[model samples]
Target: ADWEAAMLTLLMMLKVIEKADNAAQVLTALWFMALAAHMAAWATPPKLEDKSPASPEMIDFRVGFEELATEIGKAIKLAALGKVKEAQAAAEQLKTTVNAHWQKYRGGADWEAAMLTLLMMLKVIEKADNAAQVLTALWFMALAAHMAALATPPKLEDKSPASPEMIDFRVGFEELATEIGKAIKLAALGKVKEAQAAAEQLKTTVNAHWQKYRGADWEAAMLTLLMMLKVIEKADNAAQVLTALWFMALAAHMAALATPPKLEDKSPASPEMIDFRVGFEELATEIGKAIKLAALGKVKEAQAAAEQLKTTVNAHWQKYR
Candidate 1:
């Protein structure tokens, strides 16, 4: 929750600047709020919290926080002064810092990959020139953050209770994260063809891995769906539109996998499960609409559609979870 809260606050500040003619008027308050949230997130202990007090894990984590805070603070100040170009430069610096942090701290884990992807999406938001780009970036950022949450291994205190199946799931999740990271990077580079190819490969990988593991588990399917969702969210060109549409269909397939067989038969199906399935269908439809709108460069409309979709996803999750 600490990271989520901080991410949302930073997003909110960006949204304000995207629309405001006098951004400086409101940025001060937002700056303080964002800083407070970031500080709280930084102060929270890492997964290896039980390690020795002077371990590199703790030291690197704290240093990374300091670097991020310094860069983000500069970006916010430049943005508040309506110095858009300066702010963009500052954002670029922040990206460098994040990349360095990832290089130093990465353990080749799924969660680290997801975190890097999420941070990159945040930088995309910071450099966005309009509301639509910000919204588009936010959608992908949310997906990456969710993947990070799903891929996170149990903390030391909780590791004893984790089952073998859960451990295997994390292993499979790393492969998925690697592919998703490639797809996102390609999309950001405007390499639509290659990005689409990567996404197709990702689809094949997901299905193959699923079959190999014999896990028709809905949660596993849901995790793959989230990975595809980021691909769709990252699409920015006409060619990428085709990729996004294809992924939407694949996402539908994933939703079906997530559902238990014969829920309509009413033999042993719960009402909640049926309701969740219906909600997922609606969520998928909204995502398609948003993707189409974004591809057409109707960013403002796309942003609205995405915001609505976010609300639906969160509300459904709360009810089902």
Candidate 2:
């Protein structure tokens, strides 16, 4: 009975506090509400990728902070001046550019580029409004996930056909499931030419894909290279080793990007030198598309970037991360 009475008294007191028109009560309510909002926001992770001293203002990737803040501030000013249409148009322009650039590799909207830009912008300003930062991070993760679908290298367990129209990778020796399958079917039919043709196609496709994707893997480029070596070792045909060549190209580029400069290096590096290149992100998506195409046995596109990929990787890697 005493406890029930105490609970009622507390509720009644809270009701009185809630209704008070005085400054103290209003201030007290504001403080409590702010605390609650902060508590709720804390459910989200502060840092998803970075392990070291990641602050809310940390750009997970590279871009100048002042440049972004200035752009954002201009947009805000436009809005404050009752130029809402102009502000929206400016933001939309950024989205358009991001999406267009992303389409070069991803064949879709440039949400990843947009989010990455926003995240970098958020990092530059002090005490950036909380909601915007969280949203930017959320969008970046979404963009990365979408790009990943295109990024995954083909695996034996994966269901994609080893040979398709305009492409084949039949092995001369007993190796590569798809090639072996094609070889066996042709041999069973007693079509020696067809068997040979299938083997030749497989070789052609793998080799072509390998060269195109060599510089695309930002993090796992080395792993892909090693896997190609397995294919090359097991299969005798020139085509089977295509993936190996592709990976070798990619591995060299990746190692160069990830490697720290030598102590004896002549040139002095600056803070900007440590920044990850925007082109790396672009390459990651492009390489994924190329890998997907090669796996599907699309020879034309599989070979499309063979020389271009090399040039882009060499030219860009020499300059940036």
Candidate 3:
């Protein structure tokens, strides 16, 4: 889950930076964070133990991952700073990199399609004319990223079957996706009130189904959190930030659900386990503080709180992972 955690932190940092009057000045850091996210994904630990030596294809994949991250970082930095032509160039490089390896290590048609969609969304971001447009494009990009993650094999030749719980979780996710699509369409038509209503419905759907299939996995939670962060980053008022916080809180709740089931039965919990719980709680608390301050229009204070939250996230990850 370190990949998810790294990505979550990157989303949070994006929210903080987007509130700044001079967002471009801080974009370099965001670019580096993007690179870190890709590195974490490439470093994901295999679920099953295998003592065999690394294969040639595995090495190629590793190199490809690094190149993908480099291109992504370049594209994001330029896109966020409104350098359309440069961003497009970087995006083209990314597409080439993806295509180069696709024939040899294609996860599936779904994965390839998601990657293409992700690239198209990036192009939209590069040419976005307004904050709302940028946020909407980013929203689609988040969903595309999640789809790619779902299709990707964590390791070469990974063939583990999905648990029933995961299948049920996917059903709930499809329902959620439907609501999201409605909201996106409404927003694109400039129907602010109708879009807000659709967003509320999506929130209700998530609340209703999150716990029923809780602990299934972290991918959905991470994607939802990314969506919420985009909302908060582009929000025009405090109310919008508060609304997005509902989903942020839900993501934290889901993360907890995914953890306790593994640790609850350990009486006199091991120090490592206890440390993990405490670290998670601390991170959640910091997130709450940041959201509250952001909703109060205290941009500086909220940014500081987010910085602390990022520190705690990385520190805990280093200790436990």
Candidate 4:
């Protein structure tokens, strides 16, 4: 959906911008132009194929997420026993478990198995016994919370918002996601003090909203954000930290773009957002390639994809902005 597309763009733009020359500035600009050309090149956006729910694979997917808990538990226990070497080894195994589940449930509908995999990771995080294990649990927990939020529909009172207040609520959600993106980026860049400050600010905001937002979704989201924050003080690693950063950035994008009034239905959309959707979708495709490359251990290729996603998304974002 366009909402998902928009949010995906938001996340990528937020994450990559920390390099100071976020491909976002450049890519958004290009996207606006490219979208303009593409739009001008046609009467209206060409009708794409109908989206229908996919037939899920026959294999029992429950076993997959369960394995995530098992792997995470093993690592946590090893870390608690003070066997740093074994804990690290167990961590590697857990990563493998997560990656495999991601691959299996990577792309699909909102109910895709990848979400369950992430949820299991969060469950394991709840039981963490040491700072090291907590740190390890952070990325997947953040990712899970993000994806889970995406799955939730934005509503006025746990139901779809009234028409009058719809757009305002959506705009608010987008802004919040953007704010969260910045905080996560700070953490990714090792700005510990900055991240903590941002987290505190965010908590205050979430708490205030919790009083008025009758829906449980935002409350659950705030809880997850707090959990992710609890262990950032202990976070340090190459891929694990990077992975958490990646998910945090990605999740924020989806939250900002993929929910609420902008994309609640299949109704005809405003041309500006439509243009953004097209450009952002292209941006998302590149990021997907990058994630795949990383999963395959193609570090250089993944890095290249990151650069590519940034440049492309930045151009589009610039044009749109």
Off by over 4 Å in 4: 1-59, 62-198, 201-245, 248-268
Which predicted model would earn the best TM-score? 4
* Candidate 2 residue-wise lDDT, 69-162, digit = tens: 2343343333333344564554454334333322332312122222222223223212323322222222222222222222323232243544
Candidate 4 has its poorest 10 consecutive residues by lDDT at: 37-46
lDDT of 2 at 75: 39
lDDT of 3 by residue, 146-225 (tens): 43345432232243347554555456556655555555545544555565555556546655653342221333344445
Against the reference, the lDDT scores of all candidates come to 0.47, 0.34, 0.48, 0.39
Residue 302: error of model 3 in Å? 1.7
> For residues 1-321, could you state the per-residue lDDT of candidate 4 as single tens digits?
122222232233223322324222222222221221222222111121232223133223434444544444444334333354564555455545545654553354121222333334334434545433333333333433333243333335444555546555556545544555555445444455555566567555444543444341222222223333333223443233234324423433343354233344544487656765676566545544544454344555555555555556446534632
Better of 1 and 4 by lDDT: 1
TM-score of each: 0.28, 0.23, 0.30, 0.38
Candidate 2 has an lDDT of 0.34
Residue 6 shift from truth in candidate 2, angstroms = 65
Off by over 4 Å in 3: 1-216, 219-236, 260-268, 317-321
Q: What lDDT, from 0 to 1, does candidate 3 have? A: 0.48
For candidate 4, the TM-score is: 0.38
Model 4 CA lDDT for position 84 = 48
Query: Best by lDDT, which number?
Result: 3
Clashes of each: 0, 9, 0, 26
Error of 2 at 139 (Å): 34
